[PDB]
């Protein structure tokens with residue numbers, strides 16, 4: 447596997463390279479859910495493409511790739527938002543031309559809490575001064591670790607492969623940190639601080655599907671096909 | 682804060698010491714949900730006690746302690762189960778005298794998937810040969826990190842405190858690993874492997890409340906007060 451041969455430096459660039467393009471967005475509960483939902487549906491296409499370039503991904507069986515995708519779509523979309531929203535304290539930059547503010551969350555039922563969790567993460571990223579090389583690694587960790595406990599003998603081999611690439615990505619992270627000259631102890635603390643945010647992202651994502659789902663049941667969400675597909679995987 | 686002064690060794694023992702007693706359990710969807718639910722309600726009591734002894738906990742305001750508790754109760758209960766279920770492949774040891782098997786999950790509606798996730802975690806713990814000192818540390822990390830992004834100036838101080846203790850627990854983990862003689866590189870890989878399971882635990886707990894909540898709506902779950910209290914915090 448290429449994954450298992452690249453050096454921390456190649457890995458980082460490979461990842462830096464797979465990054466997708468930033469889309470542009472095309473207010474009432476319905477009008478807002480529409481934009482947000484539309485933007486999501488569009489990034490989903492890019493997402494799939496990006497997934498194909500994360501070192502090691504393509505080595506899984508075609509159904510396993512769909513599984514990780516279906517499992518982490520919203521997590522991936524949320525860390526992206528968080529990351530691009532970093533330098534806009536108190537706001538969320540869905541797009542370069544769509545910058546909602548906390549209070550605009552009140553437009554849709556039950557959205558403010560999600561916005562709140564999103565802002566808090568965004569803020570934590572600001573405080574830790576998260577680097578783009580770090581960002582790109584976490585995003586791949588999310589893609590690979592989220593659906594791993596839900597994949598038999600081919601699964602055991604699929605699980606190892608994933609664990610193995612996850613170790614490589616870990617090494618890349620530490621590599622990056624040492625290069626920024628953090629003590630060996632600061633390196634292990636940052637690592638742990640970064641990976642503990644992933645829990646919150648899981649948390650948020652779970653609340654996000656639950657919400658997107660009621661929005662769909664209330665018939666407020668449009669019929670975007672790829673987005674309903676990813677949402678159904680979960681239900 | 683004591684927390685910030687203990688040495689990795691004292692930290693470990695302090696944690697090893699706070700461990701609660703193992704309860705004993707006192708089949709139809711209703712009869713099963715009853716046992717499971719009853720057992721949970723009982724461990725909740727011990728849980729609160731235990732939380733009071735996790736170094737640094739007691740330094741938070743009284744309401745923040747209730748908040749972390751309300752936030753991580755089911756995550757805590759689930760890692761405990763998983764941990765005690767380790768050496769019983771394919772089974773879940775709720776109690777010393779209550780050992781359900783995967784298929785017994787089918788008794789209650791929607792429970793098998795939860796059991797499945799539980800088994801998978803239990804299995805991963807087996808594979809990594811998770812030590813008790815490690816177990817005790819992760820459990821505290823869960824208690825402290827889960828409700829941290831949902832706590833102002835006192836909050837900023839509360840958040841730092843928590844981040845601080847989190848680093849100390851991180852150091853304790855590494856300390857443990859080095860003592861078992863793992864290379865510096867195996868140390869950082871194991872760390873990341875241990876913390877990534879926390880995501881899955883978050884995920885499982887989220888599904889678990891969703892389920893316990895429908896079980897309650899279907900009027901199958903008894904009226905245990907402490908358990909309804911923790912469940913309501915989430916809703």
Ligand SMILES: C[C@]12CC[C@@H]3c4ccc(O)cc4CC[C@H]3[C@@H]1CC[C@@H]2O
Pocket residue numbers: 482483485486489523524526527540557560654655657658659661
């Ligand atoms: C899924 C939601 C609509 C799509 C939103 C979105 C849309 C695009 C995007 O890049 C990130 C997110 C984060 C929050 C998501 C929202 C969570 C609640 C809502 O249902």
Ligand SMILES: C[C@]12CC[C@@H]3c4ccc(O)cc4CC[C@H]3[C@@H]1CC[C@@H]2O
Pocket residue numbers: 717718720721724758759761762775795889890892893894896
């Ligand atoms: C909360 C549930 C009943 C209580 C169960 C329990 C009860 C006691 C315990 O120590 C661990 C768990 C793990 C799974 C929990 C279940 C998840 C689904 C169910 O509703």
